[PDB]
Design a protein around this ligand. Structure first.
Ligand SMILES: Nc1nc2c(ncn2[C@@H]2O[C@H](COP(=O)(O)OP(=O)(O)OP(=O)(O)O)[C@@H](O)[C@H]2O)c(=O)[nH]1
Ligand SMILES: Nc1ncnc2c1ncn2[C@@H]1O[C@H](COP(=O)(O)OP(=O)(O)CP(=O)(O)O)[C@@H](O)[C@H]1O
Ligand SMILES: Nc1nc2c(ncn2[C@@H]2O[C@H](COP(=O)(O)OP(=O)(O)O)[C@@H](O)[C@H]2O)c(=O)[nH]1
Ligand SMILES: c1ccc(Oc2cccc(CNc3cc4c(cn3)[nH]c3ccccc34)c2)cc1
Ligand SMILES: [Ca+2]
Ligand SMILES: [Mg+2]
Ligand SMILES: [Mg+2]
Lengths: 54, 338, 427, 437
């Protein structure tokens, strides 16, 4: 019913119609998580090369 | 070879449907967590509708209408009626009712219960059946959750022999095209002890549930009078039929209820389809005026009618979508021009 | 995305030479290594298997290994014998005598470093090596013993590279020696740990197919190898030709292997055809689908109805309705959903390539990771125990330095593998 | 004027980016060589289109975009594409080995080797900005790169550009077009890691786009090209307010304001109409009432779900073509009495409307027919949570058996991150339900 905030221009026009009213991690912590996961790979890769060494 | 699943084991109705399907030798039952199904006989609570219609190369169907609980809940039904203009607060066939929350429209109930008491008019209501407000408002707060207060029909139609109370149960089926099918074989769940107008507290003659009353087996086998007899009784005792005096009102109330919520639950253009069996409970007063009591989302059937109804469901609701390699229903439709 | 091919032993080189013979035709490469085709689609992903040298002559990235020169001399004089880089012919003289120990510990150890020098030389030329592939049998000595020795040593030098294999399983129906169960059991232990994909080819299944379907009263190893080469070509289609499927070996392996030890696949193919026998009638899509899923077309003598599919991959080739393909694939799953695990959603994937193989207007290659593969390992385990309970023919191995305990361990690890498959069959 | 930088991650992100910038050029009249004859301010300017394009003294209009993939082949087709002259080699970044549909590999393993390079190449663009708003990130949930490397970048961008907003255009996985099986893992993992770093995310289920292409465009088996050219139209409608004159959603901040009252619940449902086949010989042009009414048909949504069984928090109507406010209000009035539109109690039941008189531009030789008027509705409904329910169920089935988990653990990821992510998703499903019922 009620049209408001009607704005117009050459390209078009915009408005609002109301029908009824109502009723972060740091650079430190990131680089630590990435490198902690890299050491888990290095450990796993080591256990492989150890297993292959035996 | 179509496939289906079963996720409600207490369903006496669809336990018979699952049987019939397997007996055709063209349906195969899967596990209850197997997603590659054509048909789902889902549960009663938290049915995962959000996971239907996302299996490529599978036309999926379910035996429940999502959002159909608004009609099958007493608190919701009252709301649905006095909120939806299609039914309105001025409803003729629905008893005056109010939603009351334990410590809402309690203040609205009081004033409405004013001249019903302080106005010489008849006065009985139901949640317990009493004639005093505080006797009721004290009970609802004592149990726990929300209840509905409703005007008690003090002048019910009474079956002779016996001077008994009763309630009618109709089974309705809504297929995927939202065709409203009324089952021709209904049932009267009657009382056996004579209705007592004075004392309300002995609820054996006021409440007509098949559970409570188990004078059982006196006039009828199982306190269940079927239409052929009830029709004959009306003809002999009142010189009218079941079709005219009651069924027109029933077929009207059913359609009015489902057509109201059609745009809210219809699966016309959805990615999964729905059908469902409903159980409407009606009430007839001495002036042969039918009143809607409640709608049951997960209805149980009558023993005699299990075979016929459970076969009917397969024909129009299931086989219509999944065809295999005179009708027991009355299609409810009406297009009056104005 | 380059692949380094290796082929070890008699069986390995014969199916391997056959593989290069088939795909060289699909890519239009002649016996002399010169290109001669029509389309350009058969050169977009040819870097995967071929090396360019001296004026657009294509040399397979293939290394031919054996402990005796008998078979490799046949390859060199064969049809596409010239195409192979002569330096990549690495061979001994002593042979392996169908002995796993000789191939893995003594005779093969003496030669393995020479092979790795060729592997290393090929790898360093690759812009981005995606993995290795091996062809061999598990019933002999070289391809079994030395083949697994190579894999173990390749994983040591390339621990982050995919290793796939085409492994021929021994069977009493088509048998050379009685010690095949021993050699096979010892090899499976190695394969469970050090490969990403193993296509289990049972010589029993290849035999039964050649006899009961292709109508060949007495099939030879040549007949058996027609079936294998057709499958080998099929599973590598989407890697060899430009298509919808943008996947390297790693990605392909990720979506097929839910558990690291359970990577032993049942290969299938349709339509089944014999050498020379000309097919005139092109199969409909419903026929391709029904056949590639039938046990008779599987190349591991295992009944897929005795297990469940963890994952399935299918490659249709030729000019066909990709809609009809999807419909027929979705029709198998929905009709036999009990043979696919429910706890891996959408575990059946498909791909299509416009280029068909030679001789067929359209074909389908089936790759099934079924738990029914345990029947294959149970067979080997039975044949293994029957001899090992009496310690029979064991002197051939203890004479090469092996102890009885190593056999007991290999026996236990395969029975573990069997029990592993059984765990997921009842989930 | 405030600039916006687009980031296209992975195959899906890149190829969609291609489709969008292709369409942007046609809408602004920019040629493949980057020349824009209508732009009379040579060498620079601060027009509305400059939000997405910078300018060189030679008069070239270059996208403020960076393409990143862990694998060269997809982006190589941009380096040699019809719009090759459009981009700068610095804007295009490739690795040698993809993430193999492994979230952990794209995030931890391979992501670590390239994250610094991408942030630098992005910094090169941000230095050319006078007033950066933030970023539009295109990617897939299912890809290892699209899921893994995206979440890592979204974490860093929140560190290096803490003030700037960040919007997402995410491709939700569909079995019909994917050969992957582990996409549910990747989807849950990236959602959990990106959630607090994304102000507003537009999800697109390939399933919906796929069926729309089959149903309305009569394409029997949609290719990615078919999917992308349709997706680009939706993206264009959503970003048009940033690239053209207007007063609705003029900056990235206003997207969150209008569509996202609660931070976590920042996944608006998009619905687009009309979608008409170019091969359709005879077509009756649809009215404002007809196309607006189509915004409430689930068959037209980017994600298949049922808004009737949920609650709205916000709703924007973005028209393109012959439309005036009068016809819209009449259409809204009619629809309100026919359909089920329930808002939350703490929001007004209303619609923010934006109209651009220029009708939607179509790619020449494309599958879409030129229409006189089209609309894209952006409605933040709780019904979109159905997509999460689907995804979380598939996740539960596989993880209960720990299938494929070893691939992720083998890349350094912990089995605990699977459960942390899944519990966060469980909390999200609950948040949606608190608001929705
Ligand atoms: N709509 C659309 N979806 C795509 C497109 N390309 C890939 N996808 C989807 O993306 C998902 C797989 O992720 P990809 O984008 O291919 O993988 P990625 O981001 O490159 O990461 P990697 O695994 O390292 O290759 C699948 O579900 C595809 O359906 C595309 O061009 N358009
Ligand atoms: N306003 C009213 N007037 C008269 N009787 C009423 C009434 N409301 C309820 N009843 C009686 O209550 C009986 C059953 O109660 P009701 O159906 O409301 O509960 P219920 O849901 O447990 C039975 P069902 O299992 O069929 O749903 C009816 O048979 C009817 O006689
Ligand atoms: N399919 C096939 N199987 C073979 C061939 N040659 C041998 N085999 C099988 O492989 C086993 C013998 O292995 P073999 O290759 O001779 O051992 P190696 O040469 O010492 O490595 C037996 O079980 C045979 O059935 C062949 O040409 N084709
Ligand atoms: C000599 C020749 C070959 C050999 O084995 C191989 C070598 C390289 C590559 C392949 C193919 N692997 C593969 C393909 C697919 C897959 C999982 N794995 N999933 C899919 C889904 C759709 C389409 C295709 C695939 C096998 C060994 C020796
Ligand atoms: Ca300018
Ligand atoms: Mg031999
Ligand atoms: Mg990729």
């Amino acid at each position: 019913m009620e049209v408001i905030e009607l704005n117009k221009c050459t390209s078009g026009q915009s408005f609002e119609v109301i029908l009824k009213p109502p009723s972060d991690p740091s650079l430190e912590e990131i680089q630590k998580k990435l490198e902690a996961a890299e050491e888990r790979r290095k450990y796993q890769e080591a256990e492989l090369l150890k297993h292959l060494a035996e | 070879m179509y496939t289906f699943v079963v996720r409600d084991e207490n369903s006496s109705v669809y336990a018979e449907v699952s049987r019939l399907l397997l007996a055709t030798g063209q349906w195969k039952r899967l596990r209850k967590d197997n997603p590659r199904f054509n048909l789902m006989l889902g549960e009663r609570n938290r049915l995962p509708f959000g996971r239907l219609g996302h299996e490529p190369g599978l036309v999926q169907l379910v035996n429940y209408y999502r959002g159909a609980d608004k009609l099958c809940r007493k608190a919701s039904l009252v709301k649905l009626i006095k909120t939806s203009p299609e039914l309105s607060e001025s409803c003729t066939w629905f008893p005056e009712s109010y939603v009351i929350y334990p410590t809402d429209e309690r203040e609205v109930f009081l004033a409405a219960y004013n001249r019903r008491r302080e106005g010489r008019e008849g006065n009985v209501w139901i949640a317990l059946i009493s004639s005093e407000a505080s006797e009721l408002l004290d009970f609802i707060d004592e149990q726990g959750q929300v209840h509905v207060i409703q005007k008690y029909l003090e002048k019910p139609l009474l079956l002779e022999p016996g001077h008994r109370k009763f309630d009618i149960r109709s089974w309705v089926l809504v297929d995927h095209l939202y065709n409203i099918y009324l089952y021709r074989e209904g049932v009267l769940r009657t009382s056996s002890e004579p209705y007592n107008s004075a004392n309300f507290q002995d609820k054996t003659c006021h409440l007509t549930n098949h559970c409570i009353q188990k004078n059982y087996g006196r006039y009828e086998e199982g306190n269940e009078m079927f239409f052929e007899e009830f029709n004959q009784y009306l003809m002999d005792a009142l010189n009218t039929t079941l079709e005219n005096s009651i069924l027109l009102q029933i077929k009207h109330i059913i359609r009015s209820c489902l057509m109201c919520i059609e745009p809210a639950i219809s699966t016309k253009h959805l990615h999964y389809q729905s059908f469902q069996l409903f159980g409407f409970d009606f009430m007839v007063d001495e002036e042969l005026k039918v009143w809607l009591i409640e709608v049951n989302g997960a209805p149980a059937c009558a023993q005699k009618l299990y075979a016929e109804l459970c076969q009917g469901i397969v024909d129009v609701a299931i086989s219509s979508v999944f065809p295999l390699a005179t009708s027991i229903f009355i299609k409810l439709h009406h297009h009056h021009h104005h | 995305r380059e692949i380094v091919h290796i082929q070890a032993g008699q069986c390995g080189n014969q199916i391997g030479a056959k593989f290069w013979e088939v795909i060289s035709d699909e890519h239009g490469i002649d016996p002399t290594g010169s290109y001669h085709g029509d389309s350009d689609l058969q050169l977009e992903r040819i870097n995967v298997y071929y090396n360019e040298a001296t004026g657009n002559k294509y040399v397979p990235r293939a290394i031919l290994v054996d402990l005796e020169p008998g078979t490799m001399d046949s390859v060199r004089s064969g049809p596409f014998g010239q195409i192979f880089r002569p330096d990549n012919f690495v061979f001994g003289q002593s042979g392996a005598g169908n002995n796993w120990a000789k191939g893995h510990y003594t005779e093969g150890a003496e030669l393995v470093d020479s092979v790795l020098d060729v592997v290393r030389k090929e790898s360093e030329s690759c812009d981005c090596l995606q993995g290795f592939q091996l062809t061999h049998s598990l019933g002999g000595g070289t391809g079994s013993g030395m083949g697994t020795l190579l894999i173990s040593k390749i994983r040591e030098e390339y621990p982050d590279r995919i290793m796939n294999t085409f492994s021929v399983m021994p069977s009493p129906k088509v048998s050379d020696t009685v010690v095949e169960p021993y050699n096979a059991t010892l090899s499976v232990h190695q394969l469970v740990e050090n490969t990403d994909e193993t296509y289990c080819i049972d010589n029993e299944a290849l035999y039964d197919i050649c006899f009961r379907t292709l109508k060949l009263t007495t099939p030879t190893y040549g007949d058996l190898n027609h079936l294998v080469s057709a499958t080998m070509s099929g599973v590598t289609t989407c890697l060899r030709f430009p298509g919808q499927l943008n996947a390297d070996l790693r990605k392909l392996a990720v979506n097929m292997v839910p558990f690291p030890r359970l990577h032993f696949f049942m290969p299938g193919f349709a339509p089944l055809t014999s050498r020379g026998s000309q097919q005139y009638r092109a199969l409909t899509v419903p026929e391709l689908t029904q056949q590639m899923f039938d046990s008779k077309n599987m190349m591991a003598a295992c009944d897929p109805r005795h297990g469940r599919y963890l994952t399935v991959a299918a490659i249709f080739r030729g000019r066909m309705s990709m809609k009809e393909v999807d419909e027929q694939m979705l029709n198998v799953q929905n009709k036999n959903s009990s043979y696919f695990v429910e706890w891996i959603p959408n575990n059946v994937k498909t791909a299509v390539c416009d280029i068909p193989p030679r001789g067929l207007k359209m074909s389908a290659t089936f790759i099934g990771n079924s738990t029914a593969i345990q029947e294959l390992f149970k067979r080997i385990s039975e044949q293994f125990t029957a001899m090992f309970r009496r310690k029979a023919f064991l002197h051939w191995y203890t004479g090469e330095g092996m102890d009885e305990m190593e056999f007991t361990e290999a026996e236990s690890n395969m029975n573990d593998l069997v029990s592993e498959y059984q765990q997921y069959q009842d989930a | 004027m405030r600039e916006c930088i687009s980031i296209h991650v992975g195959q899906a992100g890149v190829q969609i980016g291609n489709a969008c910038w292709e369409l942007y050029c046609l809408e602004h009249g920019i040629q493949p060589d980057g020349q824009m004859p209508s732009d009379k301010t040579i060498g620079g300017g601060d027009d509305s289109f400059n939000t997405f394009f910078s300018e060189t003294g030679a008069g070239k209009h270059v996208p403020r975009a960076v393409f990143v993939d862990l694998e060269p082949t997809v982006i190589d087709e941009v380096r040699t594409g019809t719009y090759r002259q459009l981009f700068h080699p610095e804007q295009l970044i490739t690795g040698k080995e993809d993430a193999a549909n492994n979230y952990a590999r794209g995030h931890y393993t391979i992501g670590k080797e390239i994250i610094d390079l991408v942030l630098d190449r992005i910094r090169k663009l941000a230095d050319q900005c006078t007033g950066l708003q933030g970023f539009l990130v295109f990617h897939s949930f299912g890809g290892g790169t699209g899921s893994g490397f995206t979440s890592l970048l979204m974490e860093r961008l929140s560190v290096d550009y803490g003030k700037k907003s960040k919007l997402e255009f995410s491709i939700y996985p569909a079995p019909q077009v994917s050969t992957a099986v582990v996409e549910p893992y990747n989807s849950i993992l990236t959602t959990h890691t990106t959630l607090e770093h994304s102000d507003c995310a537009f999800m697109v289920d390939n399933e919906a786009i796929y069926d729309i292409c089959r149903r309305n465009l009569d394409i029997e088996r949609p290719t990615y090209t078919n999917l992308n050219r349709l997706i680009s139209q939706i993206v264009s409608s959503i970003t048009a307010s940033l690239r053209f004159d207007g007063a609705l959603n003029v900056d990235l901040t206003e997207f969150q304001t209008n569509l996202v009252p609660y931070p976590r619940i920042h996944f608006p449902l998009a619905t687009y109409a009309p979608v008409i086949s170019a091969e359709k010989a005879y077509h009756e042009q649809l009215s404002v009432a007809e196309i607006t009414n189509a915004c409430f048909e689930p068959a037209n949504q980017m994600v298949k779900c049922d808004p009737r069984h949920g609650k709205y928090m916000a709703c924007c109507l973005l028209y393109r073509g012959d439309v005036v406010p009068k016809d819209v209000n009449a259409a809204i009035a009619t629809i309100k009495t026919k359909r089920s539109i329930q808002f939350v109690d703490w929001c007004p039941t209303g619609f923010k409307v934006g109209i651009n008189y220029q009708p939607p531009t179509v790619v020449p030789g494309g599958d879409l027919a030129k229409v006189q008027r089209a609309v894209c509705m952006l409605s933040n409904t709780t019904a979109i949570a159905e997509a999460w329910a689907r995804l979380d169920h598939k996740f539960d089935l596989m993880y209960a058996k720990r299938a494929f988990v070893h691939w992720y653990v083998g890349e350094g990821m912990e089995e605990g991150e699977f459960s942390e992510a899944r519990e966060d998703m469980a909390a999200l499903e609950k948040d949606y339900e608190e608001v929705g019922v």
